Design a protein around this nucleic acid. Structure first.
Lengths: 49, 1072, 7, 99, 49
RNA sequence: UGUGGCAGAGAGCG
RNA sequence: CGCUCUCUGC
């Protein structure tokens, strides 16, 4: 709750870099549930947030 | 009652001469038989002193042979020099052995001739191979040869033992006879002039080889012994270190089927849990390289046993490994040089490539841990912080070794290293100045001591001044006494047993979790124990200083802080010939009041800091971390099931995450097992390291020929329980040879079993191993009353030191820091207490003990004395015993084995009653009065003094309490309450509770709260005498257990103890 | 009287 | 980035992991470090760009991880997360925090 | 992991007791019941605290 | 008269 | 509770 503006900032930054790297793509970015799957430790997300 | 027969045979064998005569001396508690013993003695001496045949009288006095008790045997035999060779030539018909100088890295660590390394005797030193024991190799050889001679006609498995040990002893005696036997001087040293033409490391090799071959009972034992004895003659640096290293991996291969657990509340509780062994693949490649080094060093049979064992990985063949793990440390010590042993540690690689995110967290965790330790006393303004100076001056350990110094007490000169005596000296000359901490710099570097231990490096010891201790004392005592209410330390997990020191290897084990265990013993010179560690503690001290308002506490804390400041830059005196080296070493080691807990803290912070990096790649919940100084293990549980690749990758991540801090490590991950220096668990079963050299020691103590027999027997008992078994007859032979005393060149005396096995200050062993013995008879009572009369002795050196000016001054200066209205109650008390730690000074103890032995000998020669009624324990047991009644019982087997290496009788007991449900009676002076004084002071007045003080009026008691800082109102309340009659009774209850006879090595492990043992002990209850019924039930348990140990079978008991004897015994209870 | 030094 | 030790201070002292004790606890603020923030920063963007489905792997006792996961689920869509781990995370959130 | 439709799996035969060993095969049922008891002992938790 | 310790626990002496 | 020994982390 007291990281409010920092997470606003994070969300804008993340989305910005996502869209600006999306622009440098040439193949259709299509949605599929793949066989294997990247792991993601939420502790890393807590480290970021 | 068998020792004496082996004694007789030993005497007959060693001397063998017409001139060699044998003279018993006896005793009896019965007047008539005693006077007939006196007669017998007289007539025997006379007949000996008249060149008459002695063999005639031995029939006439048959009564002494049937009813009297032996003491000793004298021996008149002349010099007869060089008899060892004259016996030994026959057992040496094999070929002698050749060394190989190109094996060890160094030059002097090879077993080459002395003259090729020490041409001058002035530069000779036996300290690199000193056995450090007052018994010769020739003694050991004589014992071995006598054993071999008596076992020359047996035809059984015993003969297979005899052939095996004969081949081994042939290899040894072939090696010795190539040159000869070194001859001991009066001090049991071996001078240059005997070793000049012989290998330098022949003696230690000989002694260690004797110890090994005396511990051979099977074929595999013979293989191990022949394969170590022939390589320990040359290799002396890469043998115990080598073979003892793979074991740490092997524990990660043993499937658990049946387990023992421990609670947080510290109680065993078995589990049928099965756990697999998820070992990665690359550690096998590591293990193979270790075996390749093993073969490359010259080992053939023992790699074969370790490789063919892995085909099954069974736990029934596994004790062999443990056996092997103990056969490595019975080869001797690697007593190398002070210089190169320091330089094993003083090689440093400090780098400007580590993190800063790690060190800052590390520093903070140390800070936080310090604050958790010190929040309560720093805040509530405890006396021990206020009075830290006086606290340290009382707790000065009187072996402490700060800086050898030339003293003078009146008309003497002393070269003591002990800091108590130094303080006594410095008080007089105005130099005592504990607030001004000395530097440790170029102007005053530090000395060193050397800690050796086989299979590992030689570790180093700081030898500091006496101000550092005083500064560190109070804070470290509060730290310990806090954190033994808390996890993560050995002070919380320690009394004796399983359910203790570890007690959580085996709760959080399954196929979900893993455990990472890691040896951190080289991490003293590391880059993470320098600056951040010290600055973290300094920061914590700043916080704590701002968390108090009183000024003495701030001074003490600022002094501890400044100690850490000065220790941050620290040089080290080491001579080398003429010049002196001093090396920059700004890091941590022992030789300090702080080292244990502080190292535990730093390792805790380190592992907590590292463990927040595995979280970047795994999800786990840390269930437990444990730290005991220089070792560490952490268990961790997962969201899923464990694999081989996750263990491997976790291990690599651990190694590299330590590498990011410039920190070496052998990362070891497992699922069932761990390994540390002293012990390990496999398959839910605790084994131990049995590496205590008997016939070779670390250093030169101060004890006599006598007491070394007792230490050697204690180490034998330990090693036997641990697993390493030596032939008990050999141990008894050594005990007789070490208690033998030379009254002249040709007169020699030999005591008996009934002098060495009696509870006193002269006890050496027990008639039946794993069982202390007491006395129901007249005769043990008789000699115990006699020897207790003699234990109290004097030391003129101590008398003159205690009569000098510095001792009086020291007591006065201790006194004057407190109130000034008691002068004949405590000053004498503090002097009497300091006397208890002047005896640490070796010449005092030697004077007293040599005097004590002389007093013993002046009643071993001539007849015996009644000693005038002085009461002891066996007097009581004599009266308790005749109202017991035995009956044959039969207990079943319902308890699980979890210490396989024990003997089968002890294990049979464990396999019929339980292992420990632990109990407490007093955690130190609990009762009424010392926990007040320990709140307003630290002083620890002896319970003798309290038992007297309470008997005095309530006025000078009131004065005495007010003199110890206490106010008047609490004294008034204490007198009004009428608690002094209660604390007479509590103190006498504490006196009976001082009986420590529950923990000698086999009673250490047994559960006396069992229901199965208890249903046998059918002693009815009377009430209102708790001490007696307590001790009666306890003693009956000891009876049952000792009969079980010595005979296997079980018995019940019954004691309809008369009320009359309760009361008759009650007054002897609370005395002595 | 004599000394040696390392850093 | 923020200095880690500050966050360690305020988190450890106000959550007060030490004084719960009703386990053989041995609690500690498992990973909060740097070289994970940027790991996440790469992971999220690269997975959304590549349309690489990514899963979650956590321990529900560390409720802070879920308190950060709810932010994640807020900003990052839900069809990017494999359904089983997403459902598990949401279910841990509901059964632990909300209800 | 998401598992494809290319995958397969074999189902165990969990058909209940066709023999009724709890009807006068007491020597076998004693062993069976003992076996399942001792298995269950290896998974009941230890009273850790 | 030439010197090798800190603290934990278990024995033996006050 | 003061000292020697056993090992213990050193």
């Amino acid at each position: 709750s007291n990281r409010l503006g920092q997470l606003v900032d994070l969300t804008r930054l993340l989305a910005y870099n996502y869209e600006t790297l999306m622009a440098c793509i040439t193949m259709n970015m299509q949605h599929v549930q793949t066989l294997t799957t990247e792991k993601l430790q939420l502790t890393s997300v807590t480290s970021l947030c | 009652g068998k020792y004496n027969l082996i004694l007789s045979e030993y005497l007959s064998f060693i001397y063998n001469s017409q001139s060699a005569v044998q003279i018993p001396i006896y005793y009896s508690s019965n007047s008539e038989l005693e006077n007939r013993c006196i007669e017998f003695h007289s007539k025997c001496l006379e007949n000996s002193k008249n060149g008459l045949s002695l063999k005639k009288l031995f029939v006439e006095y048959s009564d002494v042979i049937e009813n009297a008790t032996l003491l000793s045997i004298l021996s008149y035999s002349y010099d007869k020099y060089n008899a060892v060779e004259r016996k030994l030539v026959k057992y040496a018909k094999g070929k002698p052995l050749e060394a190989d100088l190109t094996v060890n890295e160094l030059d002097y660590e090879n077993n080459k001739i002395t003259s090729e390394l020490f041409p001058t005797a002035e530069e000779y030193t036996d300290l690199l191979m000193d056995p450090a024991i007052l018994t010769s190799l020739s003694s050991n050889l004589n014992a071995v040869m006598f054993w071999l001679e008596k076992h020359e006609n047996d035809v059984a498995e015993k003969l297979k033992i005899y052939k095996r040990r004969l081949d081994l002893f042939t290899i040894v005696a072939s090696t010795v006879n190539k040159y000869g036997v070194p001859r001991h001087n009066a001090k049991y040293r071996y001078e240059y002039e005997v070793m000049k033409d012989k290998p330098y490391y022949l003696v230690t090799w000989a002694n260690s080889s004797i110890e090994m071959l005396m511990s051979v009972f099977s074929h595999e034992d013979y293989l191990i012994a022949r394969e170590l004895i022939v390589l320990s003659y040359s290799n002396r640096s890469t043998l115990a270190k080598l073979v003892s290293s793979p074991m740490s991996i092997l524990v990660a291969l043993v499937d658990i089927n049946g387990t023992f657990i421990t609670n947080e509340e510290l109680e065993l509780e078995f589990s049928n849990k099965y756990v697999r062994a998820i070992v990665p693949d690359q550690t096998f490649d590591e293990l193979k390289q270790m075996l390749d080094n093993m073969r490359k060093a010259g080992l053939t049979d023992i790699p074969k046993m370790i490789q063919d064992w892995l085909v099954d990985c069974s736990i029934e063949k596994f004790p062999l490994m443990a056996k092997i793990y103990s056969w490595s440390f019975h080869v001797g010590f690697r007593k190398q040089k002070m210089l190169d042993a320091a330089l094993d540690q003083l090689k440093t690689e400090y780098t400007e490539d580590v993190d800063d995110e790690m060190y800052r967290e590390y520093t903070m965790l140390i800070r936080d841990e310090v604050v958790k330790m010190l929040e309560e006393p720093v805040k509530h303004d405890d006396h021990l912080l206020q009075d830290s100076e006086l606290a340290g001056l009382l707790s000065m350990s009187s072996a402490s070794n700060g800086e050898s110094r030339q003293l003078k007490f009146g008309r003497k000169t002393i070269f003591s290293t002990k800091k108590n005596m130094h303080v006594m000296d410095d008080m007089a000359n105005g130099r005592y100045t504990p607030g001004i901490i000395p530097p440790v710099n170029v102007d005053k570097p530090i000395p060193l001591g050397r800690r050796d231990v086989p299979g590992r490096r030689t570790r180093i010891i700081f030898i500091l001044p006496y101000e550092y201790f005083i500064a560190q004392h109070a804070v470290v005592e509060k730290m310990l006494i806090y954190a033994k209410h808390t996890r993560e330390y050995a002070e919380f997990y320690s009394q004796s047993n399983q359910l203790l020191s570890y007690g959580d290897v085996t709760r959080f084990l399954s196929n979900n979790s893993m455990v990472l265990y890691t040896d951190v013993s080289q991490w003293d010179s590391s880059q993470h124990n320098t600056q951040p560690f010290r600055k973290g503690i300094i920061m914590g001290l700043d916080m704590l200083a701002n968390m108090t308002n009183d000024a003495r506490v701030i001074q003490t804390l600022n002094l501890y802080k400044q100690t850490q400041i000065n220790l941050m830059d620290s040089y080290v005196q080491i001579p080398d010939g003429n010049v002196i080296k001093k090396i920059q070493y700004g890091a941590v080691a022992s030789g300090e009041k702080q080292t244990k807990a502080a190292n535990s803290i730093a390792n805790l912070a380190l592992i907590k800091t590292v463990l927040s990096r595995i979280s970047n790649k795994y999800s786990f919940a840390t269930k437990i971390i444990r730290v005991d100084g220089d070792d560490n293990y952490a268990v961790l549980q997962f969201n899923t099931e464990v694999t081989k690749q996750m263990v491997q990758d976790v291990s690599n991540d651990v190694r590299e995450t330590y590498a990011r801090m410039n920190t070496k490590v052998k990362a070891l991950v497992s699922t069932v097992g761990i390994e540390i220096a002293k012990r390990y668990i496999a398959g839910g079963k605790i084994f131990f390291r049995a590496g205590i050299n008997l016939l070779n020691n670390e250093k030169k103590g101060q004890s006599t020929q006598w007491d070394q027999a007792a230490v050697l027997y204690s180490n034998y008992i330990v090693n036997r329980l641990r697993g390493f078994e030596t032939d008990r007859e050999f141990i008894l032979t050594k005990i007789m040879q070490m208690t033998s005393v030379a009254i002249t060149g040709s007169l020699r005396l030999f005591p008996s079993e009934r002098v060495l096995t009696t509870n006193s200050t002269f006890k050496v062993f027990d008639s039946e191993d794993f069982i202390i013995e007491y006395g129901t008879t007249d005769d043990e009572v008789y000699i115990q009353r006699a020897f207790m009369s003699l234990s109290s002795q004097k030391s003129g050196i101590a008398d003159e030191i205690a009569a000098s000016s510095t001792f009086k001054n020291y007591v006065s200066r201790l006194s004057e820091q407190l109130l000034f209205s008691k002068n004949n109650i405590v000053s004498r008390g503090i002097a009497l207490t300091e006397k208890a730690k002047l005896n640490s000074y070796a010449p005092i103890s030697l004077e007293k003990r040599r005097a004590q032995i002389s007093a013993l000998l002046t009643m071993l020669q001539k007849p015996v004395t009644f000693k005038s009624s002085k009461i002891t324990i066996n007097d009581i047991l004599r009266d308790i015993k005749p109202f017991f009644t035995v009956n044959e019982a039969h207990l079943p087997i319902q308890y699980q084995k979890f210490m396989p290496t024990l003997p089968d009788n002890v294990q049979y007991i464990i396999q019929c009653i339980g292992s420990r449900t632990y109990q407490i009676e007093d955690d130190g002076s609990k009762s009424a009065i010392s926990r007040l004084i320990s709140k307003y002071s630290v002083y620890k007045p002896s319970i003798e003094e309290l038992y007297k003080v309470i008997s005095l009026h309530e006025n000078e008691i009131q004065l005495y309490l007010i003199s110890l800082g206490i106010p008047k109102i609490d004294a008034d309340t204490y007198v009004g309450s009428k608690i002094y009659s209660q604390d007479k009774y509590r103190i006498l209850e504490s006196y009976v509770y001082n009986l420590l006879s529950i923990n000698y090595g086999c009673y250490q492990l047994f559960d006396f709260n069992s229901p199965d043992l208890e249903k046998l002990i059918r002693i009815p209850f009377k009430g209102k005498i708790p001490a007696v019924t307590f001790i009666l039930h306890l003693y009956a348990k000891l009876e049952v257990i000792n009969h079980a140990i010595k005979n296997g079978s079980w018995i019940s008991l019954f004691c309809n103890y008369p009320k009359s004897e309760m009361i008759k015994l009650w007054k002897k209870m609370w005395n002595i | 009287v004599q000394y040696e030094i390392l850093q | 980035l923020v200095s880690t030790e500050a966050q360690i201070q305020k988190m450890s002292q106000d959550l007060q992991l030490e004084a719960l004790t009703i386990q053989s606890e041995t609690q500690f603020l498992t990973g909060i470090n740097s070289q994970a923030a940027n790991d996440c920063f790469k992971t999220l963007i690269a997975a959304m760009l590549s349309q690489r489905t990514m899963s979650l792997d956590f321990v529900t006792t560390n409720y802070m991880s879920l308190i950060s996961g709810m932010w994640l689920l807020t900003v990052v869509p839900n069809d990017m997360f494999i359904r089983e781990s997403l459902v598990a995370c949401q279910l841990a959130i509901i059964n632990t925090i909300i209800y | 992991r998401n598992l494809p439709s290319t995958a397969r799996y074999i189902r165990p035969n969990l058909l209940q007791d066709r023999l009724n060993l709890h009807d006068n095969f007491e020597s076998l049922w004693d062993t069976i019941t003992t076996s399942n008891y001792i298995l269950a002992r290896s998974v009941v938790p230890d009273l850790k605290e």
